Design a protein around this ligand. Structure first.
Ligand SMILES: Nc1ncnc2c1ncn2[C@@H]1O[C@H](COP(=O)(O)OP(=O)(O)NP(=O)(O)O)[C@@H](O)[C@H]1O
Ligand code: SF4
Lengths: 834, 760
DNA sequence: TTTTTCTAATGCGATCGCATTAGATTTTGTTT
């Protein structure tokens, strides 16, 4: 005959095995049938059945895309045809008619001109199988006298979700138990004994319906609203942590059921691993960094020799691994042997150490070159006869097998190594050397994967009004959903009923307040407060932060300090007052020098800087500076060309254009507009020098200055740019600058750089104060700011400024004034004045 | 049936028949209370369902507060006898392009580019342009003109080919004309207009790369959504069959791309059975530089007609509920000569900036301690006026994620790992509250770092492989332990062994390294110990949301990316995330206070050249990226005629007078910032203005405002060589650590956490 | 050791060009 047994958990698939033994099967999933024989061989599908009856996806995806390109469309869709987002709306129209058995001619009876063109495209696709029309073809193939007699018992076991073209592959063979469960989408058998739900949980479900419960269960249903998305993700990781640790139900008994895992369930699994709670857990194979370590050795072997940029990627990878501060120790110890005065690149020097043997200096950096020689000898002396040969000749893979044992950081890192290393071996055997390279815990999950789990504790997250009733419309161009029903709030309410059915111990429904949906208020009348803005946690780095917050505050202090005493006795980093941040001490608090015969050494370019802020001086000098700043090394290439005494005007321009190509500019339209801007900055010099050659006379160019300005006695060290000699015997001072914006005349005579050069001209190293110029190459001619000759009174007014400032570099606790240069300083984030 | 009686002036907006309708909602009259009482009347009296309702606002804050009064007044409508859809403007066009997106063929897979990642994509189409730009400027200064024309062509719907022929028929009126008396300045006007047409092939290679990657902008959304409605008249047909009552809020800020999208769809003369209501006042239209449409309040009534030629009606709805008199007599006189709203001050002038802050810190501390908000135009200006009020004793809430001292110690120390040449993020580490180095041990690491270290050779440095004597390889090789102190050598060795471990976790996946550095640091335990007990357990809000931006980004190289991405966010975005509080005196700006109310309101700095902000103002004839008004939409913005000029004394007199009309019009956008500041009061009001500034050599007086408000209050306290004060700082826990040291429902947790620690 | 913005004004003098420079270098949302 044909019998049927139409609630959650009520003993249906367990009853179908008792009939399947007492006389001595169809599940619908390749995972559900694994456990289905685990209950049969302990007592003792559809899409895999119609395949054998017809025996006795991206390849499919490209076929629609190619025929759309060559092609009775209504001519409004003619721009859309060359796209790749029209080949998915058209693919899913032919899929929602194959599940319902509609001929391509049968769609043409429905016409609405848009469906008639799909009705012509579908019969054009037959003339040119898949995993969708497999059941629909075995029904069209149908032997049935031999087939139906071969079977003594038919057990379909799951008919609540089963397509109508699959409903007539069973009914053709219609022994014949038709089990089903008619709510959560012939003699009749009903069931009421839940067998898998508490009477508090079962009354929550059937309250929403407008079957009894297991009386041996103890259950509770609760609803908790949070106040922010961050606080909502913490009380979940609280509740999964209270329950395992205080109550005691283990992991792999808890689950977080979400509506849709991209919108919520990916941002929530990050905010829940941080609280110590495990998640059982995607990425390509080419982007896997441990996989492409050894694929480069394939890439090098198929080209005969290793390049420059492809050989540094082996040092920054897992084969021979260097940190970023032992490249800087290799590069200094490889430019010391091949010591050309303009030194080479680092790619061109790295090949000459792998190939031959560098024997000038190597102690520990030779071992990191042997494990690159020995791999690149096994690549020289089927390709998988060399893949494993290159693998084994390295010292690699004997590391992590002696390191996947221990380690919480390297431990999962070593397991993802071999799981990505082995998954690249199996891509090689499926190819069968240039072709192999050219071709290459809590279960958080959705509602449609939450139908095959036991799950004591269940948390339904994200039950808010934006996404649990999806008001997100699904209109389109082709109009699929208007076709799917001619050929919703109440529908999504079943999913919230079919989610709470999987919980036997407890149910937690969680939203935010971003509003509560009108489903959570319908739980409150059957369930057993303001929203939470600051939620309690049970992490050991969460208690020690709160206990320290009350014991350092403007009764509870005596309670908290006893708890921090027992935390510090076993571990818990952050509890001992030897580990607090506000309880550390300075290292020295001793001055920079003593023994008062000491003589400091100034320099005239850092003397306005040292009267402007002394903390700025201590941390730009003595390390701490952002880097190279290419506008400096162009403005110093010009000071070199101008400083030569025997070159003409065309001699200088030709020597700048030859060297300019080695300057790291992006935007090669800007590397040309900065050369023509710096050709004219050499024209402006010789136009100026010949204009004032009648007034001044050169003495020397780029003079080193080193003497004793005062005798703590100061010491002046610098390089004067270009010293001149006036017609009255005086000695003016020229400081050629390459900026655009000149300094004002009110600041042109308090200029602390020129006022130390002419102070060094007086008293030896002449002996007249002379003057001072400041020539701005860049912006009649090049603008110049002038400074007067010195008096015997303004000298002493300036000599006390040098000596008073030079003693502010000695002692500790430097001043930090707020200047006009705060907006352009590197050391700003560690400034106490900010 | 359960509420208050409506006003007689509100009994015409509520009982208005279906059809287009305008409400000129004045200052503080509460256009949300009197709007949910029309969704109810258009349901209880028939005419709709509660699922045929659409409500559109700009911000998402003013959208979530409209669900909470539609849903409330409808649950009490079902008490005596489907939910309405409320969404923003820019999220209503993302919906409109996922359904009908393939007609005008834009992909439905199209990701929305962020402000920071949009800058990352146009910087690389400027640094890879094969040509001869010949522009005095730099890259990273001409890619902020690409992003400001292409954000202003996709806002007036120009299509990039009308811009190529604008420099002609003005460059010939300068040369082909004769004088009446090229002038060397009018050529400089003409230099900027031959600069747009040199960066038209730059912004058109930006659009062709935003289609080979299928990504868009927020202003690119309304460009494609505006065109689709006008081109295909079937989109509006299937939207007037779904929504039968539509609400439009703060419509005075609606631009021009949001105007011909909402006028082709919802009734440009389409269906008279649709009840359509747009609200907003023309007199709080304070933006003007962001959505910029000076129309939409005059050109609404002739734009949404009765479909038979008759224009729509317009309703006054002017009443003030959260506003007392004697603060209306000012605000009606401010907006005079520019129906006056009717109901249902202490002016001053000091001669020092630092002492005028004492005057407002008197009243803000005398009425607080006797038993309020300060509206400052510039945020940078707001910071100083929080220490002059902290010393008085009033708690202060002034309203950058990358400048938070727990995130900024995690951006750095993630930069010492990657590149040991950023030296400015080594002094952040060595001088911070962990391992406090002294001055003598910093200056002895630098001597170690030097001892480890011609035109053809100067260019040899400043190469990418150049050896520069950095500090961070004197940590990993400090030398001999006789240069440091015995306390300062024990920390360098310790620091070295921390970085050698963290640099091996560098080829690992990227959000598993930001959560690994943060554990080695003392973060998430020192971030909560610096939080008061009254907060709760909340300490790590803005440190968790850093790591919900590293893992969104890395869906990552950790050296090439996150250091180029975070540093481009500092300049371009000035902080990726602000981070909200639990939520005193609020010292918010004048743009962040649109829609709020307080008790005592202080508008502190009404000096000249400060509130009006006349300085740093430019128009279309002195910069390239400013879109001339011949083709600009809503062309207000008066355009020079160019056709009545036959002498050079005529031309440069048109230009020098059109340059005053386009700047008179920016003084008019200032008086609308008084009116959106004065009326935010509910009680007494504090107006003031200094005389001597802060960094001048010549004083600036009061503005045109403070010289006018003295004549308004009189027809009023009589409060009517700068400075050389230089701020500088020399470079409980000790009480609390006595208790924890001398000791050796919180107690049940510690006994539970030790059940996992003492059990393998 | 020494180095690095740009605009639009505000005054000059033989109207308008060349020069100095003194004031600043705004405010700020909008999808999944
Ligand atoms: N008499 C019983 N003896 C033992 N276990 C029982 C009994 N009655 C019910 N159960 C349990 O109840 C569960 C039966 O699951 P089952 O009825 O197959 O699930 P379902 O909710 O009907 N879904 P499905 O199996 O896909 O049809 C198992 O965990 C059984 O152990
Ligand atoms: S911000 Fe001020 S104190 Fe700090 S380095 Fe710069 S000038 Fe010196």
């Amino acid at each position: 005959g044909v019998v049927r047994l139409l609630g959650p958990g009520t003993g249906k698939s367990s009853l179908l095995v008792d009939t399947a033994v007492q006389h001595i099967l169809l599940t619908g999933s390749a995972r559900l049938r694994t456990a289905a024989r685990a209950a049969i061989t302990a007592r003792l599908t559809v899409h895999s059945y119609a395949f054998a009856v017809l025996r006795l996806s991206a390849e499919q995806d490209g076929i629609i895309r190619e025929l759309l390109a060559g092609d009775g469309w209504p001519e409004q869709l003619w721009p859309a045809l060359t796209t790749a987002g029209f080949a998915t709306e058209l693919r899913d129209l032919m899929a929602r008619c194959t599940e319902r058995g509609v001929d391509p001619i049968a769609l043409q009876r429905l016409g609405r001109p848009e469906w008639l063109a799909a009705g012509r495209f579908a019969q054009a696709y037959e003339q040119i199988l898949g995993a969708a029309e497999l059941v629909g073809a075995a029904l069209e193939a149908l032997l049935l006298d031999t087939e139906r007699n071969r079977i003594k018992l038919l057990l379909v076991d799951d008919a609540q979700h089963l397509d109508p073209q699959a409903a007539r592959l069973v009914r053709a063979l219609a022994l014949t138990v038709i089990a089903g469960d008619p709510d959560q989408s012939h003699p009749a058998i009903t069931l009421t004994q839940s067998y898998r739900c508490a009477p508090e949980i079962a009354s929550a479900i059937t309250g929403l319906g407008q079957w009894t419960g297991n009386p041996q269960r103890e259950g509770t249903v609760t609803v908790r609203l949070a106040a922010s998305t961050h606080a909502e993700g913490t009380m979940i990781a609280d509740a999964l942590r209270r329950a395992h640790l205080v109550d005691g139900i283990p992991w792999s008994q808890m689950a977080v059921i979400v509506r849709s895992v991209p919108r919520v369930g990916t941002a929530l699994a990050r905010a829940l691993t941080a609280a110590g709670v495990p998640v059982q857990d995607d990425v390509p194979v080419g982007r896997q960094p441990a996989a492409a370590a050894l694929l480069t050795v394939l890439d090098v072997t198929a080209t005969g020799h290793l390049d420059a940029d492809s050989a540094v990627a082996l040092l920054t990878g897992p084969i021979g691994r260097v940190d970023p501060v032992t490249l800087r120790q290799l590069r200094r110890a490889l430019r010391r042997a091949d010591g050309s005065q303009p030194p080479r690149d680092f790619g061109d020097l790295l090949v000459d150490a792998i190939e031959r043997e560098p024997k000038g200096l190597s102690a520990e950096h030779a071992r990191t070159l042997r494990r690159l020689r020995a791999v690149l000898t096994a690549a020289r002396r089927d390709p998988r006869y060399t893949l494993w040969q290159a693998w084994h000749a390295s010292g690699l893979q004997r590391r992590w097998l002696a390191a996947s044992e221990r380690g919480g950081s390297v431990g999962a890192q070593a397991d993802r190594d071999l799981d990505a290393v082995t998954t690249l071996f199996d891509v090689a055997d499926q190819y069968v050397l240039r072709g192999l390279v050219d071709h290459v815990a809590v279960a958080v999950l959705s509602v449609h994967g939450a139908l095959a789990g036991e799950w004591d504790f269940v948390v339904i997250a994200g039950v808010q009004e934006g996404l649990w009733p999806n008001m997100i419309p699904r209109g389109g161009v082709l109009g699929t959903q208007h076709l799917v029903d001619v050929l919703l709030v109440a529908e999504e309410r079943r999913l919230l009923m079919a989610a709470m059915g999987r919980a036997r111990t407890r149910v937690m429904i969680t939203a935010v307040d971003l509003l509560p949906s009108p489903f959570c208020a319908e739980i409150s009348a059957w369930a057993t407060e303001p929203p939470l803005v600051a939620p309690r946690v049970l992490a050991p780095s969460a208690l020690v932060g709160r206990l320290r917050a009350v014991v350092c505050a403007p009764d509870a202090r005596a309670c908290a300090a006893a708890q921090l005493a027992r935390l510090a006795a076993a571990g818990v980093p952050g509890a001992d007052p030897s580990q607090w941040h506000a309880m550390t001490s300075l290292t020295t608090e001793e001055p920079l020098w003593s023994e008062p015969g000491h003589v400091v050494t100034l320099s005239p370019s850092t003397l306005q800087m040292l009267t402007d802020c002394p903390l700025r001086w201590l941390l730009e000098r003595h390390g701490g500076d952002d880097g190279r700043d290419v506008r400096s090394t162009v403005g110093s290439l010009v000071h070199a060309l101008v400083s030569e005494p025997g070159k003409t005007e065309s001699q200088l321009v030709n020597e700048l254009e030859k060297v300019w190509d080695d300057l790291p500019y992006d935007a090669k339209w800007y590397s040309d507009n900065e050369l023509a801007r710096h050709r004219a900055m050499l024209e402006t010099f010789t136009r100026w020098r010949e204009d004032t050659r009648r007034q001044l006379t050169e003495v020397a160019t780029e003079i080193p200055v080193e003497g004793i300005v005062v005798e703590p006695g100061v010491r002046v060290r610098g390089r004067l740019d270009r010293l001149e000699r006036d017609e009255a015997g005086r000695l003016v001072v020229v400081a050629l600058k390459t900026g655009k914006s000149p300094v004002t005349k009110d600041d042109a005579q308090n200029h602390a750089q020129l006022a130390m050069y002419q102070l060094a001209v007086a008293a030896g190293l002449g002996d007249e104060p002379g003057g001072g110029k400041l020539v701005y190459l860049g912006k009649a001619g090049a603008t110049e700011r002038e400074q007067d000759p010195l008096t015997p009174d303004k000298r002493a007014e300036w000599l006390e400024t040098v000596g008073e400032a030079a003693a502010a570099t000695a002692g500790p606790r430097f001043v930090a004034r707020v200047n006009n240069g705060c907006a352009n300083c590197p050391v700003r984030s560690s400034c106490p004045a900010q | 049936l359960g509420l208050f009686p409506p006003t007689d002036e509100q009994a015409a907006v509520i009982a208005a028949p279906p059809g287009p309708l305008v409400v000129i909602a004045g200052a503080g009259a509460g256009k949300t209370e009197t709007m949910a009482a029309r969704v109810v009347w258009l349901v209880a009296n028939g005419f709709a369902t509660p699922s045929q309702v659409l409500g559109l606002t700009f911000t998402r804050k003013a959208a979530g507060q409209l669900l909470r009064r539609v849903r409330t007044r409808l649950a009490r409508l079902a008490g005596a006898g489907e939910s309405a859809t409320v969404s923003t403007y820019h999220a209503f066009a993302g919906t409109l392009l996922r359904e009908h997106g393939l007609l005008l063929p834009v992909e439905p897979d199209t990701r929305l580019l962020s402000e920071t990642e949009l800058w990352q994509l146009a910087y690389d189409v400027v640094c890879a342009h094969p040509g001869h730009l010949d522009t005095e400027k730099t890259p990273a200064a001409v890619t902020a003109m690409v992003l400001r024309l292409s954000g202003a062509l996709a806002e007036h719907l120009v299509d990039t080919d009308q811009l190529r022929d604008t420099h002609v028929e003005l460059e010939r009126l300068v040369h082909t004309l004769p004088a009446g008396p090229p002038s060397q300045w009018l050529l400089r006007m003409l230099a900027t207009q031959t600069e747009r047409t040199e960066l038209v092939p730059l912004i058109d290679a930006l659009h062709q790369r935003m289609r080979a990657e299928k990504v868009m902008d927020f202003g690119m959304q309304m460009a494609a959504a505006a065109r689709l409605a006008a081109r295909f008249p079937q989109v509006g047909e299937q939207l007037r069959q779904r929504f039968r009552v539509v609400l439009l809020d703060e419509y005075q800020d609606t631009g021009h791309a949001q105007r011909i999208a909402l006028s082709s769809l919802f009734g440009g003369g389409a269906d008279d059975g649709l009840a359509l209501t747009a609200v907003g006042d023309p007199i709080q239209s304070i933006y003007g530089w962001r959505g910029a449409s000076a129309t939409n309040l005059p050109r609404f009534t002739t734009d949404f007609p009765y479909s038979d030629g008759t224009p729509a009606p317009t309703l006054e709805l002017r009443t003030s509920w959260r506003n007392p008199p004697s603060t209306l007599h000012v605000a009606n006189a401010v907006s005079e000569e520019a129906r006056a709203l009717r109901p249902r001050i202490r002016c001053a002038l000091l001669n020092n900036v630092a002492a005028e802050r004492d005057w407002v810190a008197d009243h803000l501390a005398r009425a607080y301690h006797g038993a309020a908000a300060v509206l400052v135009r510039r945020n940078a200006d707001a910071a100083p006026m929080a220490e002059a009020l902290t010393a008085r004793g009033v708690p202060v809430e002034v309203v950058g994620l990358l400048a938070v001292p727990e995130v900024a110690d995690l951006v750095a120390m993630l930069r010492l790992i990657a590149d040991p040449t950023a030296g400015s993020a080594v002094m952040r580490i060595l001088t911070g509250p962990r391992w406090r180095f002294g001055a003598r041990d910093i200056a002895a690491l630098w001597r170690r770092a030097v001892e480890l270290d011609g035109t053809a050779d100067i260019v040899a440095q400043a190469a990418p492989d150049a050896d520069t004597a950095c500090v961070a390889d004197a940590i990993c090789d400090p030398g001999d332990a006789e240069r440091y102190s015995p306390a300062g050598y024990e920390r360098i060795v310790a620091l070295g062994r921390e970085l050698t471990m963290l640099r091996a976790h560098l080829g690992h996946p990227l959000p598993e390294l930001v959560a690994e550095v943060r554990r080695v640091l003392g973060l998430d335990a020192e971030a909560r110990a610096a939080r008061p007990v009254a907060a709760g357990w909340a300490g790590t809000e803005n440190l968790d949301r850093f790591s919900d931006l590293v893992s969104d980004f890395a869906g990552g190289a950790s050296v090439s990316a996150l250091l180029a991405y975070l540093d481009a966010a500092v300049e371009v975005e000035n902080g990726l995330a602000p981070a909200e509080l639990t939520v005193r005196v609020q010292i918010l700006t004048v743009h962040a206070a649109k829609g709020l109310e307080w008790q005592v309101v202080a508008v502190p700095h009404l000096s000249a050249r400060v509130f009006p902000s006349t300085t740093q103002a430019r128009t279309w004839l002195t910069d390239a990226s400013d879109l001339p008004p011949l083709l600009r939409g809503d062309r207000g913005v008066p355009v020079l005629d160019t056709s009545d000029i036959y002498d050079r004394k005529i031309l440069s007199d048109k230009i020098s007078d059109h340059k005053k009309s386009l700047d008179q019009r920016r003084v008019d956008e200032e008086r609308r910032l008084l009116y959106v500041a004065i009326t935010r009061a509910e009680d007494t009001l504090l107006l003031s203005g200094h005389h001597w500034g802060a960094t001048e050599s010549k004083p600036r007086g009061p503005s045109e405002f403070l010289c006018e408000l003295k004549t308004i209050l009189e027809e009023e306290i009589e409060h009517w060589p700068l400075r050389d004060q230089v701020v500088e700082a020399l470079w409980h826990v000790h009480r609390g650590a006595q208790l924890v040291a001398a000791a050796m429902g919180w107690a049940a947790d510690v006994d539970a956490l030790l059940a996992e620690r003492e059990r393998p």
